[model samples]
Target: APDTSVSNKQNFSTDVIYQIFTDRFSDGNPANNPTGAAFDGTCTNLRLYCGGDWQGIINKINDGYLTGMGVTAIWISQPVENIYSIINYSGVNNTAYHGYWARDFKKTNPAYGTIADFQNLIAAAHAKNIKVIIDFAPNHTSPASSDQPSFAENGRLYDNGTLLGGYTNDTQNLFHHNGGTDFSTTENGIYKNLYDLADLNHNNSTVDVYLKDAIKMWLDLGIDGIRMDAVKHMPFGWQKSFMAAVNNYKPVFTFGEWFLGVNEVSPENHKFANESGMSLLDFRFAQKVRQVFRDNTDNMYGLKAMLEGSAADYAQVDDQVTFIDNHDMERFHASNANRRKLEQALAFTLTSRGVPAIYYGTEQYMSGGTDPDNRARIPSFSTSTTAYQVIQKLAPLRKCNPAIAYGSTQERWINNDVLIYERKFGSNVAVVAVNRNLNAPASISGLVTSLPQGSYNDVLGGLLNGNTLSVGSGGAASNFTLAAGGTAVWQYTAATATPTIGHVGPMMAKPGVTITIDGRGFGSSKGTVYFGTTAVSGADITSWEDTQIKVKIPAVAGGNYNIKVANAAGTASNVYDNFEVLSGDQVSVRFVVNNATTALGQNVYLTGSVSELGNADPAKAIGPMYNQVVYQYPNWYYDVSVPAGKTIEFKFLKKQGSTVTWEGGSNHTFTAPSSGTATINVNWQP
Candidate 1:
């Protein structure tokens, strides 16, 4: 029997994503368009809706505008119904054109389209081999003021047009009333409001259950993935539980927005992507690329350093979505800059590691400042632009060439203004050269690549003035000067003989959940699969192939483990690490201890009867609960994802580096809820 029966869901590495601001892309139906002050016929007022909807996206998909550029995915604005109220922010009237300000989770935003329209959009996109990713802002609802009950629908939440509650009269405690964030501490940011947007209280079972069911509804509509907005503001435990709820059922390729500043790097971001069941947008990569190429604040060395640091930081770096600029930042192309800079950046992103996303209007060379300015309408649908053509020539390569999709990156040549890096995965290889200096060309020598001996044509086809490559034996290239402000991509492809794990989708789930492993050369026979040291074979191996494998996760105690595979001949593949097996169907619960004091370096750790809480093992205890973020010591708190409705006994301890001091008491016991989240606060007995 042939072994090509498996399809990998978690693999988006071979995709080039086009991000569309639903209100700004295109307007196919004038009937659904908002009228008067809320709508803008001419999109000069960036705050107003321009009437783009699902129909418009469907039109573009059918008209060859997006498919022509080789985009395999489209990330659209949230489809959930938002507040119809047009509020006056200071002096300016604003609407939910961006779709971040939610009012209801279950219904469709009429301004965007009906549910039928969304179904059509998904059908059309999938028909064209394009995946659909929707931006979901679970962090908060519409901006509101408790004092002014009439202000912006008072951040009122609804369930199918039935008023569930509003911020002003929150008897159910649905929203966080903890004032606005100063961002001085992590907990403050999580508990407090972001600007005036009303934050949802995930610790509240009603809010938690509502959001969980909401996402499941969207998943039922055939959405391929989700882009979680403001992940930094949410509890990591709650998010993991949320992810489990999704991955355990209908798994999709999910990533979150954890914005990183210029030259900023955080291990917390890496840890979240590694363990939280979802990856993040590569803001570090985006910011550095901006400084090196657009702002000229850094050189090629800085660019290479960022790449190296990023590759090391993330366990599955390919899962991190990469982009040069987006709706939140100033457009990569400035009003006065040369277009070559943007083109080179596009070329670099398309060939670089990770999934690549292009903001709407980027191909048209649209230029602007931050937010509203950066989020202008698509200037044109023209495919003749150099940037558009650059994407077209390189985007498809992600699918066609394995190296571009799942390779390791190494810089082969570098200078103040030039960088040539090689990406190699198994038998496939791609070499990309980028020169940021438009005024001066550089002589390239000592450039080594994995490409076999031959004459190689630039994948760009001299569009950026890159010439042909003459390669002798040993992967050495004939010397030639790289054109100024030039970007060239050359690649090689061959079937991989070694078993390699390129990616595993829905990285976290409960036992019995089947995960898909995608890579190269897994062989055609049944092979051994390992979740850490636990072996799963026989009937558990649902499908196997040379490039993909589907196997149910065996019953391993709840914890994170590395995944590896062995071919039928017993050849081991590279390890794909960080797979989380839940204790069971899970819910997030916040554990709070009052008067658990500690030293400056010491912090609180929780030991419990589940693997997520170390299963009562002192060595595997959950964490040093944050006093700075969501808890202020001697009142420390930490959120844990635990089995729903399962009775668990847990105790707390103070840990300083390698030393641990347990509380002088028996274990505290409680049962996790069947749905929603919980907050359990108790006093430490010592």
Candidate 2:
């Protein structure tokens, strides 16, 4: 059977992505070969350039396994034919196997195969419901060949009689080294190599025409998209302008390699995604993820800071691409930590960010300390061993459940070492619990209750709870415990119920505006709810599932009022005007870690619990009969335990579906405890 990682199980909904480094994924044929640097076919240059080709990917898809695993998009390495000659720079062992050294943009890298092979591979991928995103290099071209005659006296190639070289009036050279808005001047005789690719002078119009046309040619061939290589050095304006051109023909989902932090990419200093209008590989959080997950340092604080920082920078950070390792960085498996903790690392990656892009062999436990090492070929699928199977299982879950993809979230409990949180969509919900403390029996409390009331099968551990779950006052059915570094994700849904608001409110524009109504037979005497018309549904709402009546107030145009409830038992209200938007108004909340100040783990309060107020996704609810907890329908929240820490970050997750709020300042950092415990408050607005 496929493992949970490979199964259709997820805590949130998301786009499925697969990554393939062209040189290592596969070698379709050994027949095709070309002269020059390519003439050396021995394994001596194997690490620098592997024989994997586009056809290999085609073969894999046509062969069926991965296609069935729910791969939505395939991200491949740069395909431009790199330098034709080898550069023995001391002991760096440079070769063009990975496609970064581009010698020709128009031709296929013969080392892999032929042009037909590439076209065929792309066709195969598309046939499998997979979109193809090719790697593109606009920052530079292949360095001039000393063995050939492309080199000119002034570093500008003048190819009239030379071998199909140089961009000229009649020749239409795709490369130009000089004569434009010169962004560079030699400092001590060293020019910036765009990832060692000959930096193209983009200030020149011919260069622009050449590169854009080349991209157009590929697009015309039905390629779905392009991944700009070394995007930071390229004039941001050129990328922005070029994308506008590309979009005219096809709406492309482009991603860039900024390799910078959130502070560097913020809107003021030229935002990456915001300014370029293209999603970028999220290196901001990855840097932190690397530090925390790999080095085993101070867990809580740094992790929260990193996530908070990312939220501050990107417009739709969750929609940005995220990964543990890629072609440019040290391999995930061999970084500060080895691959033993891979399962947990991946759990965090898939559960937390934008689309998760798995490097070719990361799931198979491949490891390398640096480039070339990290760039090793993917082992044959059969012999490889690691996290692949688990991922295969998990990938489908993201596609099957929309709640897991774009849901709202909250953490009912957190500690320096343990964490418990829930992600809720309109009616569906998922809960996650992770423990990484040594010798500590970690327990998280506040679990949401509003989801469709029914028994659910824990997708992660296969545990089951019947429809009539008995959550303590805190909400979660029972305590969720974990061993060191262990994690659990539970999915639940509330019984479907047409929403019935006891008293529609007098619109309130700020917090504390008031009014009241009587709660007769609000819901079957067993009915419980909280008020607010806004969807605010995800995990954070889990706490109010047991309340007798939930009220909602519509947004009134240019006015403010309060919602109140009067029942045979009593009357109550949230005194603060719910309308006044705070600097970072929270629609809901997601928990951070426990234990230390800002440690990265789940926090659980023995008294907190969650329930869905409206309906739930039966598919993800994970049970035969999904409607048992009537209060869970419509919306849900979970029970949790507050961690023993100081400061933690909170986010305003979506109220209805898996969609998180996109507004800025939706996050805040607060202290936990130096001694006595203090409550961390998070409120949502209508």
Candidate 3:
């Protein structure tokens, strides 16, 4: 039987992901390993290639390492060719082993494998019910300096073998020449170089066109998803346009890497995940989990707070990728900490909401700190580890239990050191209890869940000291003592009685694109799917099942809409809000407003007749027009995805907080290009 959750490119809520640092994973063919100073066959030096390749990943998929842990998807390092130079940073030699320093987006790094090997890997993964997602870094190329183009790959870009341009003397404006950023402001970060690394100028038509074409080539291949790198550093509008290209071409489950510091929660981040056509890494979730479980600085209440807050913040919370640690952060385990701590965290994350990603070597309790240290080669592939067994027991629950996959999380009971939570979706329910205190057991009571009244065995089967759970009437648990460092999972699943829309994919797209809606309780008969109020059924509703639906978006006016469904009996499912219908085809257009001055925090905004420009509304203008990313001050510019080939009238507004001052003019009119990208320059009116 096909697993629609893995086949549906839009949703991964019912799967657990394994993120591999490719260079450090496995080396099936040592022949492709880099030689000399750039090679670390022993895997001591973290910055050099360790020979892990596509064949190695294929090997693991076949050998039962990942399968034993119940990983349904694998997120690998960027497969693009990177600068092969061994650069001397300070006194240490560094290599592009992490694969972020892209020199050519069109070709695969030989160290990974040939195109045939990658295809084989994809087939092998899909054969075993696993999906493969590759990392994509469109932000910049390899590090380079203007005068020292000899260093590294000169931050040069290539169209396969054709030399497009190098950063040293970029005549076509392929790269940003602005100096390094101070990281103080969003505009500042967008315009400047990240250290010595070059920044791709998305405003540059050549650069914009090249990236779209490059990404399409990969989509032409069978990549199940994309993990965008440095999303915050890129222009939000450009990324949105980039996402448009992907959705319009071949929609896949896409997400971006946006880092948030400890205790840092940004409304901007939430908006990006909500509107940008891509989800974001759940850094806030990771940070809070760290504080609560690993660091012990916060308790169960704080953990519950993060879970509740993030569920509210992200419009599609289940789509957001959740992880405790990654390549950029320290390993979650400490060298001296009790093994139970790591085991509990693994069990907790595996059963939690959202698409959980386990960093490589985590199940082995690998402990290291920071950058190069955190990226150490996997010491072993032993599935006998307790953490591995914990993941093995719990990761598959997402597939078997609808409540764990697309459920509404509720805190049944909580304390400083103990938390009991329930996840409810339709008739399915999963209750999880965790006692983070390692030395003191907590008395758990007053816990109420939606689970059916019955005695249940721990999903872990007392693997982490979890005992049986006896539920009384009213979904209340009979008082039980939670062991110190205990982690328990209990659940009940029944046939879904009512229709529900758990998720929709390619949430933002033009009409006629087919989107997948996954949940439960839809009868296995023809149903009506609605984009906003316009109904689509019969032929437009391509496929329907109790758990999923495939429907083409109706040709509705461009804007956000609430998606709902009706079974054959006309009983409407719950509305899935904020589905965006684009105006039409998307063209990347840079709107320039010259002589647009503003006070601090007061920025220029572009509003117009099209939905992309807020449909001419002053309240929903398209800005804080960037002041410097396109090299600006008095002249502000924003690269937006507007309806292609359509003539649009627009105006500039000076906005700060609630105040809006529209340009004193009827409207400045211009036509969007038919393809690729275009620029429209206009002067501020009055």
Candidate 4:
């Protein structure tokens, strides 16, 4: 049988995204530049294209710029073809250089390259096991272009008698030309025009078909994920529908841009995430990070609150995209004059809960105030930059460590200027400390209960100056120290100790009889089950969970023996007098038919005098039914302990709703085997 459980699982939480603007990164092929391409090959006009293309990115990947930074995924600007030339936006002739002004949804913009070039880019990224997430502008389309296709021509607008451009004029119209949105008006906040860009009416069903089809087309062409643009301007219902369609084709990771105040509770983004089942870009974290780490307007208290609040509020907090700067925001360097502060922010972002995204050119100290400036072309790529080194040292830990990916997080230490947290999974633990005090070093000493007592080397400290931060012995806590305006990360692997045995069942069982042992600290890893000193082979062990283990008693000398379970992590657990070897027959009982199709399937009641048999009342039932049996025969089974030759009376009953369906006849009588386990099989006549 296929392992369905693991087949659909996604590890998006561990991803580190590198956002790239294709038109500004590199110009691998200058020949493909469109005639009159705005700003054609010059950084002088930041608003125009600087001729970055797909091949240029491929070049960087080959040169190890992306991988060196430990980027697991790349989020590139929209690849769809935009209006061929510059269009009037406000008073300026804005270029379609950013790839957002889409003229066609299914084709690539000529300025970026051809469909083949796009395919090659995806293939190359896949070769390195790197995910490719493309930007999508599903909320709107370009307002005007000479080559724009009509709704009828594109075959996507809702059909009705009156047609406008590519849509019907009435309710069927796909484009909303209802003036700009008034944030004060509830109805228009997400339905009105977004500046000069025409907002797409999400109420139209055909719009969903068109958008989903377009998304699937790209996905089929090898896109691994999508970053939706301007999601706040779209209806929550629309967001749900669009994401549903895309996921139906295949479960691809998706996050949206919901520009809201990070410090305040943004109910809209929260609602969108819950109702839409799609992660949202955390503008909240972004703003707080900028303010705390970059602007330094306040201490880490606000940032700590945001992190804690998000962890409580969002179901998938780890996948919410977190960043310090992006195409729309002022570069970190521009906002914080101190280069050290920029590095601190980068470190925080990389070590935070959510998937981190590094805007291209950030590592090389790229600085721009806003808009076109923030979206600067990558002047160069280097592995020697401090920012690059920070990511290089931290991203690997984020990727390789399970504690960093799916661990339980706790704020170990928090103060006005310093924040420390622990991420732990099983025995693996990581402690992250960030110091906002720019002038002096910060130190905190205490037992961090999350980490096992031991000494650990600061993995991140090695990348900085030769300074080292060693954790004291593992116990209930650990100590930490951070250099001035610096970040530190410490990691350690702890072995799973012997599980504490709480209880063991079938205290009396014959050879080959299955018995259940319950305990705590049983790691997920499969471990050995022992009866006294004998190891139960895998063939004798039926099931295993972190808290429970089931094994068939092996043939051994009849007497009292201790039960023990040892996990692969070397942690072992033991319980004394919990198991007893018997020379009597093993009693095995099986029911032939199910009581009802609606009855609780896994429950099988075996009522008898044995106290362990749940005290004979149907209310205190014991042993569960197993659906697996010979063809058409569904049954239940139980092993009972009656003194070797004692007679015991028992009956079978199945739970039906709130009542029990007891066997019609008088209780059946059975005798335990005098020298071995006994077998009893009967049909249910309830």
Candidate 5:
């Protein structure tokens, strides 16, 4: 519908969002932690104390780790002063680490540092062109003074220091009286909280002016946006009025907390996004993705279903926040207990969707029993673990491609082990294939094969050639085998492409054949060649000519495989016309080894005579969907027990009529972990 005549459809092209919880990030101001007994400022897992003020964010911005992850936006916690009092449950409960328990919306939470500190934080982030979305809790405030009347002592909500109509107690109304409060059009009186949150009386005209002004002040402070908390419990009309007021001035990005996807939001509840002029967090997608990640044995159909519903129900799926794990949910690291699988889950999230937010320490493999543990402050950001690298690699792709943001999404294929889909923006296309299993065949189709013919390199597992992909013949829909727990992305293009094989083998000494067919317009310069798929970029091209496509051979009888040429140019010569399956003359009991016995530096020789040169890349292989390769004997094998630090020696020899010839051998004084020897299993073509 758009200018798709070329391919520039996009949502948020060039933006990588980073979400941070301020209290747990860093603490530069110890003064912010409540001091003594009444609030007891004691910092413990059980009490509300660790002081990670907004200033810390300003200080840490120089590290640019966020930049390394392609962070364009930073979603920090509620910047206002949360419950001014200390919450001490001993060690039985986690303190209010997340700034959800609000005390005052009119003022920045002193526990998070002063308003100046917050302004500094926003200024620094904005200097980097990062959008800052402050958390706003309008649903309630801290419990109205425990011993006082039912109105806000601030006097901004009601008038004359008098509690509104809904007071139930003799003078101690402590909660929202839902009896007369439909909260549909409008309701009166401030809703007091039982958990110490001072419920805000939004219906009060005085309350509206103060809260609305407070929002404007924060926006003027350079807070780029707001994450409105608890929208469902607020009056819809009030929400509409509040949002209309903001949009009238600046284009502030806003999304609401819908709580439960099923209960708080549904198709019937769809009007909230449209009427309130704010997108609701895709709680439904979050729940569904959690379910799918929890049990991939069921495939990603649940994820697909949620996505389909997002389009059917929500006006803007891209605007709705989508995440597999966040501050509120059970950390995937907790229940799954499989961080490897967790990486796979994250891979899918980052490469697709609205906004993929990872809880702070998700990359460090952080997990907790529940909320507080899940909300633990990341001890350090300098973690160089696998999860860190995984995030580093996946985050940038979304930033580079807008299709990942606002592009049209189409499912290419769906199965228990694979979820393949395409996201297309203007002329750009991003294809994602997630292999749920280690060796599952991802059958992806609906490819814009008309796209440029050049090889679309995957940011994850290698690349994909145009026309045909050797990921096992299901080019697009072709079922190419994917390594367990792997995800790949192939961008669309149309340029002279390369061969369609991936990680070609008998790499591990198994009999297999992989072919390299030069596409049309590929330059032609032929030479005698053998099979090897190990390309060293532009460096070494050993024994391989322009087209020495490595084809997997079997461990069967060895013979003199005479060469013959026949193609568009016609048969050059059948040098193999009289060739026969010979015995000792052309074939011998051979063993292949990675080049050892040399100086421990030279290439290991693979000993094997070609039996036939009739076949190219095999039409069918093996495994989950026949994606295996067949080659001669002597596959690659590693010696795990022989640590390189131990005193070890080993030898490999080939004997011809008792005239023994030694080839690959090595000696080393290394550790036991490196002492294990390498076995000779070199498989190759003649």
Candidate 6:
């Protein structure tokens, strides 16, 4: 019973994921805990299972432990069956307790529970509006275990039917059969065997189909997202195909795990993001957050560089899974003994862009040295803890206000130990400041934004001991002091005169038909009404009011469209596919290019700061920089919809390889007259 009400891949950006190892979080059913194997509920070693199961997680969901902490999504470790028993290797004890060594991809480990119990957990989670993102390891599986014989019996093999996982008779083309990889080089480090886990032959299409089909099974079983494990070891082409198959069924949220720096955009992870169409876990941000706030090795500048670099490198910054600690590394509590410093670091992750993931037992201040040590059993879920309370306060803010989650960030101030930034989206805004110095107060001055001049309250244990900060007349907030070793978070709502569209009349009609838009909170001031790809302004507006607008629809083909109304303040009512545009006359507006004959293959493009061309803002160019204009002999031109009396400012540029030559001086402007096909020509700037 997959709940369709849960947020899909598109809206998953607002989620704050709580990562939990199922075997360590809780043990609700004592009967399911085995006696002879690693399942012993003792205070012994970290390598053994602690008997936490899916039923335990379901019990917590029923009891509201996770929701109490304001968790929107829960990322559970692999639920699939792993090696049935324990094994000793690498001079350290190894077990399937961590849920990584999957012996079977389709079946649930009897230690955790049956498949019914897993479904029940998903059903319960969806009932609470919490998404379930499962950890998926596509690269490798457990080494030869008691239940499983040779790797080829149920493993990836070559075209000649030779086992790829450390098989002596196998060819090197399938798996990197170079014994083990050297950690110094990227190719050897990622492509070869990782740890003691058997590396699958990514080059083998049979392996690709197997992994993808296995993942598709989970997606079909109500998995909302996936945390791809060992993505660096896999090839980008295979990863891309895997994602394509999964997305073709249903677009599930997918991110990769690369051990490299989360801040640094390396080739493998970057390719996984941009080429494979998968987001990555921000390991770089995790280390940097600990370094600046926990270890005191760097300052706000270091954190700023991480943020800027993430935005520049990653295709989608908000989709990156960000966390301070996980099952692999040393817990943040162990590294930083000070609870306040740990809280500050947690605040930084929650407040920054990307989905903030909190490792289990982090709120309880659980401490461990490293692997095996880091994966500690959760004693209990105490909501009264400082870290839990901090997340509680921050999670709701992230969910309610799109600004904190998806808004553009503006750095107001940054220094060694002090930093200030603003997240603004339309009418919502959040100002956040972090100070590491505990001795004295740090104040942020000369802050300017669209926020109106007023007094705002601090939501997250603010400056001046939770006091209010005032905004100056120039939209700047001054003297906003952050308590020593504390953070200040002030939120304000900006005023706007934008129009809201409620209902549109003649929902289905011809292109030239007149439509009436009804909604409240509209101003008499002139505004633009956009229908489909056409924007109607000026005299085309038959009537205007605070509650309704009447406009003669422009000519557009039959299709569904998002109707929006934009005023001086900003755009509004961007309801997707709200209006149904019917059949009408297809007008062809031609643009004559008199210059492109000189640079035939050099790529001529039109760059503009307009929404029609996919440019959301004025900061940068958007859409396809090179619009494939078919060259018919001497005249090179293209045809499209240019609304009646529409004026667009654009510039021509020539791009070749890595270089771009721009036109000198001002932008080339043109106006499209109302109706009928019109042809316009312009000479080359050269």
Q: Which candidate leads the pack in TM-score?
A: 3
Worst 10 residues of 5 by lDDT: 620-629
Which candidate gets the maximum lDDT versus the true structure?
A: 1
lDDT of each: 0.88, 0.48, 0.87, 0.66, 0.49, 0.66
Q: What TM-score, computed on C-alpha atoms, does each candidate reach?
A: 0.97, 0.62, 0.98, 0.68, 0.61, 0.70
Off by over 4 Å in 2: 1-13, 33-46, 91-93, 144-196, 261-270, 335-340, 383-386, 438-441, 447-454, 462-477, 493-686
lDDT measured at residue 626 in model 2 versus the true structure, 0 to 100: 11
Candidate 3: deviation at residue 28, Å? Answer: 0.7
Displacement of the residue 297 alpha carbon in candidate 1, Å: 0.7
Write candidate 5's Cα lDDT for 594-686 as tens digits: 422222222222221122211111211000100011111233222111112223233333333324344433321212222111222332222
The clash count of every prediction, one per candidate, is 3, 151, 0, 21, 80, 2
lDDT by residue (479-566, candidate 3, tens digit) is 9999988989999989887788788888989988888888888888888987777899889888988888888878889998988989
Looking at model 2, residue 544 earns an lDDT score of 25
Off by over 4 Å in 3: 1-5, 629-631
Stretch of 10 with least lDDT, candidate 2: 606-615
Q: Give the CA lDDT, 0 to 100, for residue 413 in model 4.
A: 81
For candidate 6, write residues 1-686 as lDDT tens digits.
01112644434556788999888888888877866656558736777778888899989988978999988889998877776645766566557787777756767777788878889988999999899999988677765322344532333332222233333344543334444555665445545666555666654544544565577777778888888887777644346545544543555777878875534547546645653547788887888888887776777888888788777676556667899988778888864457887888887788778778899988899888878787778866788898888888888777666567666677878778887788876577887777888777776667676567888777875522445668889886766566788776778654334554434443434455666564444576667788766888888887766545767767665445667887645556545243545333222344555655445455555554333322323222221121231234234443333334557666655566656677666866787544334555664465
Task: Please write out the lDDT profile of model 1 over residues 1-686, one tens digit for every residue.
Answer: 11121123467888888999999999999999998889998998999888998998899999998999988899999999998888887799888999999999999999899999999998898888888999998999998999999777899888877888989988899998879999886668888999999999898888888899999999999898899999999988889899989998999889999999997888788888987889999999999988988888999999999999899889889899999999879899889969888888888888999999999989999988888888888888998888888888998898778878888999999989999999999999988888899999989998888899998899999999887887789998989899998888888899888798887877889898988888888998889899999898889999888887899989888887888999999988999877878888989999999998778788888888787787777877777587764567799888888898899898899888889889887988888888878889988999
Q: After best superposition, candidate 5 residue 185: deviation in angstroms?
A: 15
Task: State, as a TM-score between 0 and 1, how close model 5 is to the true structure.
Answer: 0.61
